[PDB]
Ligand binder design. Structure first.
Ligand SMILES: Nc1ncnc2c1ncn2[C@@H]1O[C@H](COP(=O)(O)OP(=O)(O)OP(=O)(O)O)[C@@H](O)[C@H]1O
Ligand SMILES: Nc1ncnc2c1ncn2[C@@H]1O[C@H](COP(=O)(O)OP(=O)(O)O)[C@@H](O)[C@H]1O
Lengths: 49, 426, 434
């Protein structure tokens, strides 16, 4: 009882707070979509014109 | 027990759309009851969805409020399940501040048609028995399953991967051989000493696994839209996606379909409360339902002959005849007493509460006097007064108590006519 | 296989060589006066002489105003641009209404550019760079069909280094475009280490070198877009292209002046040829009075595509005018700028043929008694309702163990799924409970 009344750091020290840190799954793109499925790639010969 | 995010909600009791092979609904099963006409009709629509061969098709579920028109539409989603896209929106959800009202329907139509592909991958999986490295670089790895062991000469791009990710002897790991990515599953139980612990894989180390994968047709549009597309998929930055990109992607998927490298999996759009759409949005549904990539869509409404939004014109369902001519209308019907009591039993199973048989009778009277939905809301509050009473079971005087604590709309409206000048505006 | 869409049964206008309409052909039936007239519009579009000239298909719901407009697209074929749009797409939230008209008017004019495709692919056997320093890089290629050496431009070798290519990789070079892709490491090197983070591919069984004539389709709108804003300039491989979000923009009038001046230069040099296409506007009555007053200029303009409009409204109010009524929902001063085609209601004897054509397209066998009965439903309701009953009735027939429609299967569906008329009667008889 005296410890808390004297200074609360004698009972619990104030912790070094920080935001909660999180990651999702990486968003999985199929090899097929990556090979044949972007207009930047499959249309590049047209895009030149 | 613990509670996950999904808790007991207004449709949690529906675990399917209970039907025989004949597409005839038995009186009560899979958590829903009655509606023999509307559920036989929903069975036929569920087969049109599962067949997939006919494109751009619509059903409107219509009838008095509280008659299960959202219930059969939600049960149909549970019965359809994973491995076919189903997407739901409320009619006022398309009115974006950041995107065209017409484009918001074009996204909803193309979240709900899937592309499906299969790809083969050399995957290595095992317990790492030992790993060694030198100062270019050279090194050596050993992996074990319950049925074989190997040693391996590592290359440099693996050496940098194993060392970056601190792979240690006694881990159980998956190596994506095509990509150099390491996933660690845990540690072996025999090296759990000095957390997560797991047994070694079975079979051989290097498996040529086949992965089937699916991408919504819209999810291909967003990948194509930006220097990195997929961020805009989650963050909502997808907006006014350039229609010439769709003119290409729809034609590209239309050759993958027939070169056989992909197959398209028609899903469902459930555009709930359809009477919220403007005549401008109906003008889009009039024409977006007439192309090969269109899903089947379910629409639900509870409106009489009504003013269609954006005009002074009145028409059935709150939909212009323009669009009703595209579609089939399935009518729900008002519940009988038998069906009303049976829904209350099933809600009492789903909320896990006991109540007296005469309690179910007076609650069925209340249900028939108040269009069911209010009686369903009394179930929980009656059980909480029973818990306050330390009762085993809900009694008639628990229901008669709670019926006086919480008003239905009719008694609330009637009391609002006593103090009619004390409330503001009339 | 392909999915059966609403208009997948129509394959053309099906006119005979005199220009007259057959009674039933190419998936269409009846409609002679309207579809004979669409023949004259196909002759107009294929003649290329005209700009901005326009047509209005008018008449009740379920009468062919979308079917004939898509039949025109089948008579033109994939070689001629046909841009479909809904009048309700004009309400963008990033650009003004008149810009969405102008973009769609520019999607309906096509350049037709010819170039030889030239692909080299194979395992790379060597690289040797040859101011004296790098005039070119020699590269050696191998496939199971043989070998070549190629003399690369330093810009292509910069792309090989972009892809992190080395000798023993399998490469695709598109020599007419400068595209380069690593397919994988060649599997003759698959034992260089027992476990390394590369994917190995078999030595290509294809030719080292392949040629085609290819024909590129590009619209004037693709030029107006791709040249207006600064490009991303960043082939993913970057990071500035993460910061500025791409968005639609009110592309200036002047730039279109220069695109027209550059395209004129190239069609004179014979590097390109032109196909003035069609813009097809579904639901034209859903355009605002401001949009209709922009078409009072756009339809005059000496570069504009042919325009086809559809409407099904009576003498209603014009959208956004507060109180002005005009036929078809179109202002009289725009209606005075279009050739109007009227569209007829079908007799039951025409509807039965449409139901048969839909059934045999949709894959349904139907007994003559049930086909007569869907003809009777065509007397009660509308063509679209009767057509829509076929697949539902097929599923009940299939569940009842037969591969053909018979009376009780269609009579079940007729009791099970309502039309607009019957459901509107059910609403009016319970009007106080909705
Ligand atoms: N002459 C025809 N022969 C065969 N089928 C036709 C014919 N004309 C129209 N159809 C049928 O009409 C149905 C609806 O298309 P239709 O062109 O009639 O739409 P519409 O009502 O005129 O268009 P909109 O809604 O924009 O006014 C389609 O299922 C199609 O099969
Ligand atoms: N057939 C049914 N079987 C079981 N529960 C039902 C059934 N029909 C309705 N319900 C319950 O009653 C509620 C009222 O029906 P609902 O579909 O929500 O009506 P509405 O959409 O018109 O508001 C449902 O949300 C559900 O809780």
């Amino acid at each position: 009882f005296r410890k808390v009344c004297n200074h609360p750091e004698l009972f619990e020290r104030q912790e070094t707070w920080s935001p909660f840190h999180i990651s999702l799954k990486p968003y999985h793109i199929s090899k097929f979509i990556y090979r044949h499925g972007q207009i930047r790639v499959f249309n590049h010969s047209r895009d030149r014109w | 027990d613990v509670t996950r995010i999904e808790r007991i909600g207004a449709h949690s009791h529906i675990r399917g759309l209970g039907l025989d092979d004949a597409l005839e609904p038995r009186q009560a099963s899979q958590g829903m009851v009655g509606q023999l006409a509307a559920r036989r009709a929903a069975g036929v629509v569920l087969e049109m969805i599962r067949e997939g061969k006919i494109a751009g098709r619509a059903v409107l579920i219509a009838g008095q409020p509280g008659t299960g028109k959202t219930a059969i539409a939600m049960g149909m989603a549970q019965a359809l399940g994973p491995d076919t896209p189903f997407t739901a929106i409320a009619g006022s959800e398309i009115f974006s501040l950041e995107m065209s009202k017409t484009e918001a329907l074009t996204q909803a139509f193309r979240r709900s048609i899937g592309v499906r592909i299969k790809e083969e991958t050399e995957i290595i999986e095992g317990e790492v028995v030992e790993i060694q490295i030198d100062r270019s670089k050279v090194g050596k790895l050993t992996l074990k399953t319950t049925e074989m062991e190997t040693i391996y000469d590592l290359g440099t791009k693996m050496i940098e991967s194993l060392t970056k990710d601190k792979v240690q002897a006694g881990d159980v790991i998956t190596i994506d051989k095509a990509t150099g990515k390491i996933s660690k599953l845990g540690r072996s139980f025999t090296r759990a000493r000095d957390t997560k612990f797991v047994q070694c894989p079975d079979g051989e180390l290097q498996k040529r696994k086949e992965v089937v994968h699916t991408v919504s047709l819209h999810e291909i549009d967003v990948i194509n839209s930006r220097t990195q597309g997929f961020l805009a998929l989650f963050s909502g930055d997808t907006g006014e996606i350039k229609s010439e990109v769709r003119e290409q992607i729809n034609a590209k998927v239309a050759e993958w379909r027939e070169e056989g490298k992909a197959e398209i999996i028609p899903g469902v759009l459930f555009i709930d409360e359809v009477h919220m759409l403007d005549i401008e949005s109906f003008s889009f549904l009039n024409r977006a339902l007439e192309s090969d990539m269109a899903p089947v869509l379910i629409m639900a409404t509870n409106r009489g002959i009504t003013r269609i939004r954006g005009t002074s014109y009145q028409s059935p369902h709150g939909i212009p005849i323009d669009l009703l001519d595209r579609l089939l209308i399935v009518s729900t019907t008002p519940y009988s007493e038998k069906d009303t009591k049976q829904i209350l039993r099933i809600r009492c199973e789903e909320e896990d509460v006991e109540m007296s048989e005469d309690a179910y009778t007076v609650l069925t009277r209340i249900g028939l006097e108040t269009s069911l939905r209010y009686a369903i809301q009394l179930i929980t509050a009656a059980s909480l007064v029973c818990r306050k009473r330390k009762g085993t079971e809900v009694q008639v005087d628990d229901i008669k108590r709670v019926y006086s604590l919480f008003l239905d709309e009719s008694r609330s409206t009637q009391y609002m006519k006593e103090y009619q000048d004390a409330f503001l505006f009339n | 296989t392909q999915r059966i869409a609403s208009h997948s049964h129509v394959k053309g206008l099906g006119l005979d060589e005199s220009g007259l309409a057959k009674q039933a052909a190419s998936g269409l039936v009846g409609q002679e006066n309207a579809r004979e007239a669409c023949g004259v519009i196909v002759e107009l579009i294929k003649s290329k002489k005209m700009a901005g000239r326009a047509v209005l298909l008018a008449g009740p719901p379920g009468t062919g105003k979308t079917a004939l407009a898509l039949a025109i697209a089948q008579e033109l074929g994939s070689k001629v641009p046909f841009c479909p749009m809904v009048g309700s797409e004009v309400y963008s939230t990033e650009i003004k209404k008149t810009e969405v008209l102008m973009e769609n008017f520019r999607r309906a004019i096509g350049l037709r550019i010819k170039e030889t495709k030239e692909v080299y692919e194979g395992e790379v056997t060597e690289l040797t760079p040859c101011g004296k320093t790098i005039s070119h890089v020699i590269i050696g290629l191998k496939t199971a069909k043989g070998t070549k050496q190629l003399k690369l431009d330093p810009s292509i070798f910069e792309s090989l280094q972009k892809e992190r290519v080395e000798a023993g990789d399998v490469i695709y070079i598109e020599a007419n475009s400068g595209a380069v892709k690593r397919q994988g490491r060649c599997d003759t090197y698959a034992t260089e280490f027992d476990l390394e983070a590369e994917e190995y591919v078999p030595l290509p069984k294809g030719d080292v070198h392949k040629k085609k004539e290819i024909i590129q389709d590009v619209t004037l709108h693709d030029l107006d877009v791709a040249n207006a804003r600064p490009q991303g300039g960043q082939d993913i491989l970057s990071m500035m292209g993460q910061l500025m979000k791409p968005k639609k923009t009110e592309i200036t009038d002047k730039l279109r002046g220069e695109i027209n001046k550059v395209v004129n230069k190239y069609i004179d040099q014979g590097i390109a040829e032109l196909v003035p296409g069609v813009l097809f506007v579904d639901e034209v009555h859903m355009l605002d009075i401001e949009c209709f007053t922009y078409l009072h200029r756009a339809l005059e303009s000496s570069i504009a595509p042919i325009v086809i409009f559809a409407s099904n409204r009576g003498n209603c109010v014009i959208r956004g005018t507060e109180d002005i009524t005009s036929p078809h929902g179109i202002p009289l001063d725009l209606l005075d700028r279009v050739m109007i085609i009227r569209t007829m209601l079908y007799t039951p004897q025409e509807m039965k043929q449409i139901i048969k054509i839909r059934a045999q397209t949709e894959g349904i066998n139907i007994s003559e008694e049930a086909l007569n009965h869907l003809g009777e439903i065509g007397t009660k309701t509308t063509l679209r309702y009767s057509v829509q009953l076929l697949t539902p009735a097929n599923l009940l027939a299939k569940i009842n163990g037969k591969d053909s429609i018979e009376k009780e299967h269609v009579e079940e569906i007729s009791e099970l799924f309502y039309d607009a008329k019957s459901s509107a009667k059910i609403l009016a008889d319970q009007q106080d409970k909705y």
